[PDB]
């Protein structure tokens with residue numbers, strides 16, 4: 001290949017629109033690909049491919065899919081150094097994002113009749129093939145950081161601000177008025193006396209909550225699969241209760257209803273804030289873990305809610321004269337509370353027994369032992385083991401999942417921004433001053449390929465030897 | 480930071496050696512000094528080899544725990560601010576900050592079901608009974624069960640990861656200790672105390688990868704030899720005599 005390139009050989013496609021680079025990639029010929037890369041004419045070799053072909057795509061995507069160790073060299077070619085002296089301050093590193101851009105750029109014609117390329121093509125190709133060693137290369141890291149500081153940080157701080165604009169005045173209202181009291185824009189109704197100090201803050205916060213609820217209703221009606229999501233339910237509850245909490249801005253309302261809606265609003269607000277936090281990378285793996293553990297716990301209540309029924313309905317009969325067990329529902333809630341080890345042995349079992357107030361002493365003490373064995377020991381250890389397994393499974397894929405979240409974030413953001421804006425904020429390179437403020441499988445695969453080549457050569461040799469025997473001269477050693 | 484705090488508070492604890500001082504300030508500085516002294520002693524202990532791996536484990540677990548408070552401090556806010564509204568007539572929940580501290584204390588399973596929920600309910604002293612009992616169930620599920628099991632699983636993973644490299648890390652600590660000590664002692668002293676040999680009387684008071692690598696090398700040598708042989712055979716064919724079997 002090097003000899004044929006040194007002479008001016010043409011670079012064309014065939015009947016399958018495959019160039020020689022596609023054939024070298026599909027057969028995992030590493031050395032010829034490295035030769036094509038290290039040489040001149042690499043630019044035209046890269047440009048020669050053609051769209052519209054579902055089998056022979058852009059050379060970069062194919063190189064990511066088949067020979068990632070060559071893509072690593074291709075990326076190493078994109079880091080330039082200045083003085084090559086780590087101590088110097090004018091020593092800067094320049095990163096070039098030449099091969100991560102859209103394939104529709106390489107071709108000069110670019111018809112794009114039916115060709116639609118998704119944003120961040122190279123990074124998505126790396127994610128869909130688990131090329132974690134490539135996603136950690138400094139060029140890709142700087143590419144993602146550039147995208148972030150270019151528009152992602154801003155597009156998400158706007159969302160956080162739009163939510164906090166209703167989240168913060170709610171909390172300010174709660175911790176500044178005594179629960180149970182009625183209040184309107186004029187002040188606090190002390191039943192009638194009217195406390196009027198701090199009325200300005202109260203009015204401002206009541207207006208900011210109202211506007212946020214209205215805009216949330218409008219946005220959600222604009223989005224209206226919908227009822228299936230959980231965020232939709234949470235936000236519907238938040239807006240419906242927050243609009244009632246501050247309703248005395250227009251029409252009177254009983255204080256009881258007002259504060260019983262405030263108690264739900266102020267809880268679901270801060271519970272929904274975690275779904276906003278799950279975007280950022282330093283603190284979004286904990287939300288994944290929390291969700292996994294919560295799902296695993298909820299899938300087992302369909303089973304381990306009959307243990308509670310058994311024990312609660314038996315304790316309702318055995319200990320019926322005591323207040324905690326004086327009703328079926330109260331007796332089931334007390335048994336749920338005893339699940340962590342708070343059994344009240346001395347208050348519910350020993351002291352009534354020494355007063356001759358247990359109707360069934362032997363059964364009551366046998367139920368205590370069987371409950372202690374079954375629920376605070378066996379069931380809790382089962383849950384702990386399940387959680388340990390789930391967290392290990394999540395940690396096994398932490399880095400790839402963390403990077404894929406960011407890639408998907410920016411990919412989704414690209415499909416909604418206007419074209420001219422992306423043109424304006426996009427960059428082609430970056431400059432950095434440092435001073436200023438799975439292996440064993442690959443090995444055995446390679447040696448399998450080597451063994452197959454060995455077999456092929458040995459068979460050719462065998463044929464040659466048989467030819468020798470059938471052509472030679474035999475005179476003195478004839479039979 | 481630890482040593483700055485220690486010295487600044489220890490100098491105030493014993494200041495009446497020169498200038499008078501109120502007893503309140505003296506003992507409130509002593510309470511901080513006597514705590515940070517014994518907390519800083521562990522950083523001295525972490526050098527010795529029989530007991531320095533536990534400090535590594537402690538540090539790893541503590542860092543992992545502190546990286547998640549930026550998240551799981553909003554669960555506490557949610558539950559504390561809702562309990563402040565639902566159970567406002569009770570002393571433990573009579574203020575936002577007290578209500579957030581009580582919720583932090585309930586995280587280990589000390590919920591006070593009978594004292595805060597059942598007995599006020601049987602006296603008709605709960606303002607919102609159904610909501611108060613629903614919050615109890617959701618809290619019990621979310622925090623003493625899910626969050627604590629999450630923390631336990633994280634700790635198990637971290638400790639396994641630390642134990643995987645225990646021996647190498649243990650030896651590297653000693654090597655680095657002595658290396659750093661060598662760069663500061665005087666030359667003649669190192670000459671004086673260094674030895675060249677030692678005498679001991681006993682009586683007196685990752686493999687699979689290496690294997691496949693070796694066999695890869697063997698396979699490459701085999702290929703090379705086979706190619707040389709192929710060339711020799713082609714030479715034989717192009718030099719031999721052919722007379723009776725000619726076409």
Ligand SMILES: O=P(O)(O)O[C@H]1[C@@H](OP(=O)(O)O)[C@@H](OP(=O)(O)O)[C@@H](OP(=O)(O)O)[C@@H](OP(=O)(O)O)[C@H]1OP(=O)(O)O
Pocket residue numbers: 030446
């Ligand atoms: O032609 P090279 O780039 O030098 O690489 C090949 C070989 O390539 P494969 O991995 O495709 O079999 C290995 O290269 P690396 O994996 O190390 O990159 C090998 O490695 P070992 O020597 O460790 O066995 C050795 O390359 P290198 O000497 O750079 O390590 C060898 O080439 P040579 O045996 O002719 O040096």
Ligand SMILES: Cn1c(=O)c2c(ncn2CC(=O)Nc2nc(-c3ccc(N=[N+]=N)cc3)cs2)n(C)c1=O
Pocket residue numbers: 144145148152153277279280281282283406409549
């Ligand atoms: C999504 N993502 C990153 O997060 C990221 C990144 N490159 C660096 N970061 C670091 C980072 O976490 N940055 C930021 N964290 C916050 C933040 C943290 C806690 C909060 N809790 N509160 N209140 C609220 C906001 C704001 S900016 N890239 C490429 C990216 O895609």
Ligand SMILES: Cn1c(=O)c2c(ncn2CC(=O)Nc2nc(-c3ccc(N=[N+]=N)cc3)cs2)n(C)c1=O
Pocket residue numbers: 524526527528529530653656
């Ligand atoms: C750092 N190191 C070793 O530790 C070591 C060693 N060879 C043997 N040792 C054993 C050892 O632990 N020795 C010692 N342990 C203490 C000690 C223990 C507990 C204390 N707690 N208190 N109070 C205080 C001091 C004193 S001497 N080599 C080569 C080394 O480099």
Ligand SMILES: *[C@@H]1O[C@H](CO)[C@@H](O[C@@H]2O[C@H](CO)[C@@H](O)[C@H](O)[C@H]2NC(C)=O)[C@H](O)[C@H]1NC(C)=O
Pocket residue numbers: 184185186187189192193194249
């Ligand atoms: C906010 O609530 C206060 C308290 O009820 C309202 O003030 C009362 O208004 C009525 C009607 O004018 C008077 O008869 C009462 O005497 C007022 N109360 C007091 C204590 O003076 C006030 O109108 C409410 N504000 C709004 C906008 O509805």
Ligand SMILES: *[C@@H]1O[C@H](CO)[C@@H](O)[C@H](O)[C@H]1NC(C)=O
Pocket residue numbers: 190191192193
């Ligand atoms: C006004 O509020 C105080 C407590 O804030 C209360 O003691 C007093 O009874 C209230 N006044 C009336 C008329 O209810």
Ligand SMILES: [Ca+2]
Pocket residue numbers: 220223231232235
């Ligand atoms: Ca929504």
